[PDB]
Amino acid sequence: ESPIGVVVSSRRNGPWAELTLVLTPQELDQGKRLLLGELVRVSSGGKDYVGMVLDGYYEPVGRSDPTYTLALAHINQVDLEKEDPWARKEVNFYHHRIVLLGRVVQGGLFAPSTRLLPPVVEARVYRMTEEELQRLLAAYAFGHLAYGLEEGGEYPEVVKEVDPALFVGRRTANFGKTGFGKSNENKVILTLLAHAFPRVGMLILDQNAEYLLQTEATTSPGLAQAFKALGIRGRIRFYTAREEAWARRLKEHLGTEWREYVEVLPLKVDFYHFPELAVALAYQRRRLQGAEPPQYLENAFYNLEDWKHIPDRMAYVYGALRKAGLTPRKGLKIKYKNENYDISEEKSWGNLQEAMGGARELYSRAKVFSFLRAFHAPGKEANFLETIKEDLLGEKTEGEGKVVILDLPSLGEAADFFTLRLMDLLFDRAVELYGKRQANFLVVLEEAHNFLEDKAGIFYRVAKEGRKYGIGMLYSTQSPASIPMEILSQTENFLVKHLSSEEDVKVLKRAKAPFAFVADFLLSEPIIGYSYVYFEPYQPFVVPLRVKLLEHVLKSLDS
Amino acid sequence: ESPIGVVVSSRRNGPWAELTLVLTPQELDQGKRLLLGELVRVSSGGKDYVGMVLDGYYEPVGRSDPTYTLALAHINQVDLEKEDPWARKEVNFYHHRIVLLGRVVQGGLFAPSTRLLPPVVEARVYRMTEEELQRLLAAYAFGHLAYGLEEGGEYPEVVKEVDPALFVGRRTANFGKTGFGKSNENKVILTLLAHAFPRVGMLILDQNAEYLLQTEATTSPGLAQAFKALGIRGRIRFYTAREEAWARRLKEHLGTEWREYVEVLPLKVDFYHFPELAVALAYQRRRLQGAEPPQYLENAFYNLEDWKHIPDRMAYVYGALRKAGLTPRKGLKIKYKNENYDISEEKSWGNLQEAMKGGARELYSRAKVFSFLRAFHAPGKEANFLETIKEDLLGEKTEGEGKVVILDLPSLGEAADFFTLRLMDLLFDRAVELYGKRQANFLVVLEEAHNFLEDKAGIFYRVAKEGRKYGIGMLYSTQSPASIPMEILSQTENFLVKHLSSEEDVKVLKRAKAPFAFVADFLLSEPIIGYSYVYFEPYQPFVVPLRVKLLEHVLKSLDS
DNA sequence: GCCCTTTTGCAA
DNA sequence: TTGCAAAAGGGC
């Protein structure tokens, strides 16, 4: 409980304040060392700061010639330690560099950096204890502090706790090369949130079919299995286009009672039941792809509801839908003029075609509804977009919280349009509902480099304006250089694993200043599960961690 | 009132002169210190300058070895403040570097930089007093000077005040990261202006439904609640397409007397009363698009006034409107040929269509071009919200009344962009027409400015360029300096910058304004909420940190 | 984004 | 039958 060394300098180096430290022969012989990246406590005029050891080098102290002294001692076979204690007391020194991150304020928020530079004769450096480290961090264990693989740098009793106030309404980045634990960390965080704070909903853009169920050895279990193990019931809603296959897999991997944990829903709708929905999708495709809508589509989009009362116009619309190539359910009847036809049968379909208001233009241009074949399935009668919107922002659903997983791969090549439409609809509804209830849901999207780019930027709008409505993002990109700076600069949290490239670390430092002190560690130490966590404004400095395996988390939390 | 240290050097570092300062051990022991970014007064040849503390470092003075001395003292375990004062007295020095921003001359005008380099022997540095700082800032508090979160570096008695000369007629910028106080600062400025100078009109292009009512604990209260607290009556005009819902909210929050503070109007009009408005909107829509509106549309737009006197042409126009989809009110009559139909009924409409020219027939045939107008149509309104807003802002009856206009853009849906562009064009044209008879004297609040100031041909771009002549101000927030063109950034007069994380943002800011080169490190390193770097031209052409105030505290203080 | 084609409808 | 206007899909 005394200073490690003696401070012999200080300065302002860029936007940070440093101070040099010297370790004397006594402290070096006793066995006191300092690991690079360690956190120390600096006292200057009665105040306690937080420092991080950056560098370390050897330099002569006083008027000495260490090279000559050591070379001569080696030549003469003179054992310095046992024979010349007075010669081992004038070369045994060592310098260090320390950077003042900020000052911890009691009952308040960590004050970053410092505008005051301490004189040399009024600064001390004390090693930090476990209680102080816990007070620094804590102010459901998600990981514990650890400095590299060095012995004595592991602190299993210092942990970082998951808290909805850290993730809800704020963007979180997740970087790290392949096989280093991004998905495992995401699963751990989501499981802990769902288990501890059941009032938070999530929307998962499952791009790789790895979240609901995972059985290969190349990754940890999935959310469905985790929920079953933890005892969470009736919180997962799964939307897929392969309902039967996924139900078979779920039954196999969860037993005969899988329906108590997962609700499987289809991504199909009978467009002969929602012609207005079909028109809206066709009209919105143009806007979502840059260009402006045609007038013959604007007119229909605005007037279809009125058209519904004119049987002839409705017959025109249904004929356009059928001519597009959408197979109807067996037993449909049209009423052109005052005669009932059967578009399901080829004979009556041709009769109606030859027997046959803006609906005429729609029938002529019905070659534009062909892209809707992906989402069309006869006899469904369930608007999945409305179902998702109600699940996420229902009046009564407030509180309980729901987890929504979308099986994007099952949608073929329409996944991009479907995701853009869903995001636009959800954000518009959230903006409308402002003041009546907060959205309070978290958007999870892996391979975010794909989604964070478009015309009109639905995801740009979500990232840059979701804070007010409690709409938080948590994206994994695997390479910082692939994310636009316009979105990188708006990210509050960070979770960076090992990054091999140099451009990646340079971009990370450029986007977030405090990440310049760990670039060398990231470059040189390829360790799996080792992450540097940064959280504004509660913990505005980089801290290393050893993330926990999902199996271990489940086993520990079962009790 | 004694020099803090001793000047021991000076030079011309690039375009700025600088000089080094030394703090002696006696002063260091007394407790004197200098904070980075602090403002100090420099005396040289009978003229006082204004300097900023830039850097600080430790360097040995004289023939000494501080490293060896301190290491030996530590080894021998001798307290360095009670046992060996003569050894502690030769290593307790410290250097500072100071930059001269300029000197104030005549009536507060700021002479920039300096062509004269002061000799070391006759240059002194005095700490600046509260009176001097107040004079510096001055020539209804908005924020008090503060140097970071360092205790002892805060001056609650030094404030920057709100004055229409600062804002109206000049462009202001409001940058910062997401969640740091841009909206709160905007609301503070607006509330102070509306409480102090009631002859300044505003136009808030609301985009998130936050400037009228705000109850969620994620932003400061709304302007409606602020006005209710401050006792300002009959000054807010709300334009929205959700009259009933907003009336419910106002009733449930402002109380039962809410109609005194907020006046609600709808964004819907009946186009059967303003066919000229319908045709003008349809014609303007395409021009705001690519270009070259069709000849028939041009002809209709120019000659509808003449058409008004011909019932046959007007019947063709009304038939076109009805065919587009717009619903007329019950009991409408059309005089075609020599007959009076009732287009509100199916059979009458069919008969008229069967019965049915200088340009009206082509419009009737191409009736699908008016479909988009169904996003504004509501039978039985006869309001012309565009004209009403024009009278509210640039009306000749006001000559100073104070009118706060808030537009609920989200309610419109996908027509908000076109509506905003058309309204801005109309307002600017009217203001240009009014030049030489009366000034507009109003401010245009704009949020998410990067959406509007992108294209060089935009009406918002032209307003930003040419509004000062006619008295039209601006105040835009964008969250990122990199998203605004340099052409606008250079010409902007006022700045209010919060924490910025990206190096590109700070580089852009310093490229646009040279004096912002001394605060890049602070911006990058300190993520403080509510901390602002204000720079106002031309009276205060240097960066001064502030501590913006919460709207709740501003209200509670102004009540007295 | 930008630049041609095809089609319909109303002259003549 | 031809010429001209105006809207919407293709290629690059």
Ligand SMILES: Nc1ncnc2c1ncn2[C@@H]1O[C@H](COP(=O)(O)OP(=O)(O)NP(=O)(O)O)[C@@H](O)[C@H]1O
């Ligand atoms: N904290 C950890 N401790 C130990 N092993 C871990 C840890 N995190 C991950 N792993 C191992 O790393 C493997 C890959 O994890 P994974 O979550 O797929 O990384 P990843 O970021 O998703 N790579 P990828 O998503 O394919 O780009 C797992 O199967 C584990 O064996």
Ligand SMILES: Nc1ncnc2c1ncn2[C@@H]1O[C@H](COP(=O)(O)OP(=O)(O)NP(=O)(O)O)[C@@H](O)[C@H]1O
């Ligand atoms: N000067 C201040 N002092 C204390 N809290 C503040 C101050 N300014 C803002 N806040 C708080 O900071 C949060 C964000 O407020 P807000 O003004 O909406 O920031 P913002 O910049 O408008 N967010 P954004 O529109 O995305 O940039 C709220 O909780 C405010 O109460």
